[PDB]
Every structure is written in C-alpha cells, then in structure tokens.
Design a protein around this ligand. Structure first.
Ligand SMILES: O=C(O)CNC(=O)C(=O)O
Ligand SMILES: [Mg+2]
Ligand code: NI
Ligand SMILES: [Zn+2]
Length: 331
C-alpha cells in the first residue's frame, strides 16, 4: 500500500503534467496521496492564475462574518455574527489595522503557538463563501472556474442526469480567521488555491481515521452531539493539536503559501487558520472513487447545516432513504 503512514504529500507537476486535471488527481492517488486527507500541489513555474491582483478592491463582501469564540483555548466553538457589507479594499485595510493585524513572530511555529494560545480572546472577521472567481479566463490549466462539474461526473459514472450547478467561491481572510473541523458536503473533494497574501495553516485527519475524530468530538461537545447526529456539519467546532495529541488522534499539519493548491480528499476532516490578509478560491469536485463516499456521507437533520440547491439532488440520488428526513432539515 502506498503512503501507509498517511503523510501529507507535496507534488510538483511539470507544465506537461498540468494539462489534464483528472489524470493528475488519479496519479496522486496512485501514489497514496488520498490517505493523508490532504495534498499540496505546487504549480509549474511557468503557470500563473492571472496577470495581476491590482484591480480586486471593489469586490463586495456582502456579509462579512465576525467569528466569536466560546470555550477554552484548546476546545472551543465559534459563532458567526453577520456584519455590514464592505469592499475587499475596506476589508484589507481592516485586516492591516492595529486591532486585527498579525503580531510580531519568529517563524510559522511561533505564530501557530500564538494562534492556539490567543485565538479565543479575539474575534477576527472572515469574508467567506463569496460566489466568484479570480482566475483569468485565458488560464487554461487548473482554472477552478472551468473544471468538469460534479453533475457531469455523476452522469458519466451512473447515467443519471440531475439539475444543479457547481461554481467556485472566494474567501478573504485575516489573522486568526478560522475554519472549523469538517469534511466537505457529501464528503466531496475540495480544491483550494491561495491567490494572494499571507499563508494558511491546515490540520487534517486521515480518512481511514475520521471516526476517531468524531468519537472525540462527541466527548468534547456532548450537548451538540445529543442535538444532531452529524453536528460537525455545522462547521463550528475547534480542537487544538495539543488536545488531539493528548487523545491519540492521528493527524498532520501543513502550511499553504500564496500560489499553491491544496486538495482535500473524501472524508478527510480538516481545520485551520489564516496568518494575515489573504484571498483563496475553492470549489468542490468529484471523481469516480468519490461515489461510494457520497452514498455513505453523514447528514445534518437537526436543520442547522442548511446546504445548497445542488446538494439536494446528490442526496436524492445517492441517499434516497435519507432524502425525506434530510429535506425536513432543509425546509
Ligand atoms: O479556506 C478556507 O477558509 C476553508 N477551505 C476549505 O475548507 C476547503 O477548501 O475545503
Ligand atoms: Mg475590483
Ligand atoms: Ni473544506
Ligand atoms: Zn445538525
């Protein structure tokens, strides 16, 4: 078996190998990359996502989210308070303010220490899930706005034609902005490109050990666990690496820098934080190997997790028994 310790792999494709997305994902998996839950892909040196980022300040962040923490430094939840709309220019200015900026630090490890020590005592503002793309239409390779769609994958593999579309989303982050422990909707893959700015640190549990994370999470968030059988779909729970180590949960960590791709694999739980002002673009995608994960994915039926028009069709076709009760959560 390739990659039996489930280490995060880093790939360096040539421009020639960067021409066929599906075939490169298949290559990565041949080398065991999926076992970790997360891989990094460094694009060829000749590739660029677009010519410059000089004209992005007028993008609107219609609902910035203030991420308010509760709990203890190692084990907390965050709630997202809606703030008034601001442009990307306004947001970058706010991110760079004395109140919100990244503190002085030695290296990524000192900054990670400061994050886990101090996160709960601040409420950074996140511009998340903004439909859109920053790829130039003339970028032909690994353009997250031109991938083949999950609907077409289901059609090619399974023969069923469904409604729905699949488009990318932009994330504008600042110091301490946080993504809680989750897998993707319907345990899909995701791909994330860091377009500009400061890094993003990721933590990931191997898919083969996801249930161990869930068991710990039920113990650490006992009331949430009673209220919903898949409460990590709410995307509010944080657990530090120290706590994961104390409880024997296998995981890995890696820092993504501007100009690099990350791929998360089906049922790879991940969490992380941003080092300072940045902009990422991400989209879900599927392969043939995904199909059985889609059939087995947990679902939120307390109704908190509340998810897309397009995810309806996936649940209807892959999880017809759940469909009924699931749609009660979403209506
Ligand atoms: O970048 C973020 O804030 C979160 N991204 C993801 O969880 C992802 O790409 O799967
Ligand atoms: Mg603009
Ligand atoms: Ni994700
Ligand atoms: Zn729920």
């Amino acid at each position: 078996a390739q990659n039996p310790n489930c280490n995060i792999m880093i790939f360096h494709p040539t421009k020639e190998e960067f021409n066929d997305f599906d075939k490169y994902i298949a290559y990565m998996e041949s080398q065991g990359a999926h076992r970790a839950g997360l891989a990094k892909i460094i694009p060829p040196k000749e590739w660029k996502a677009r010519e410059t980022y000089d004209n992005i300040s007028e993008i609107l962040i219609a609902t910035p989210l203030q991420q308010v923490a509760s709990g203890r430094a190692g084990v907390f939840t965050q709630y997202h308070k809606k703030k008034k709309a601001m442009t990307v220019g306004e947001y970058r200015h706010l991110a760079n303010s004395k109140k919100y900026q990244t503190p002085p630090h030695q290296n990524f490890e000192d900054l990670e220490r400061k994050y886990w020590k101090n996160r709960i005592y601040n409420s950074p503002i996140y511009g998340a899930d903004i439909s859109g793309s920053l790829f130039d239409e003339n970028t032909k390779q690994w353009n997250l706005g031109h991938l083949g769609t999950i609907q077409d994958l289901l059609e090619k593999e399974c023969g069923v034609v469904i409604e729905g579309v699949n488009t990318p989303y932009l994330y504008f982050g600042m110091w301490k902005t946080t993504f809680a422990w989750h897998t993707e909707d319907m345990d899909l893959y995701s791909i994330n490109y860091l377009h500009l700015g400061e890094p993003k640190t990721w933590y990931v549990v191997p898919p083969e050990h996801g249930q161990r994370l869930e068991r710990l999470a039920r113990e650490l968030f006992p009331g949430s666990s009673r209220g919903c059988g898949a409460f990590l779909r709410h995307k509010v729970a944080l657990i530090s690496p120290t706590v994961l180590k104390e409880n024997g949960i296998p995981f890995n960590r890696i820092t993504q820098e501007a100009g690099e791709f990350m791929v998360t694999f089906p049922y790879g739980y991940h969490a992380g934080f941003n080092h300072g002002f940045n902009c990422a673009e991400a989209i879900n995608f599927a392969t043939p190997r995904w199909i059985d994960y889609g059939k087995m994915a947990s679902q939120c039926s307390c109704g908190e997790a509340r998810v897309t028009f397009s995810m309806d069709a996936f649940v209807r076709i892959l999880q017809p028994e759940r469909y009924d009760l699931w749609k009660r959560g979403q209506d």
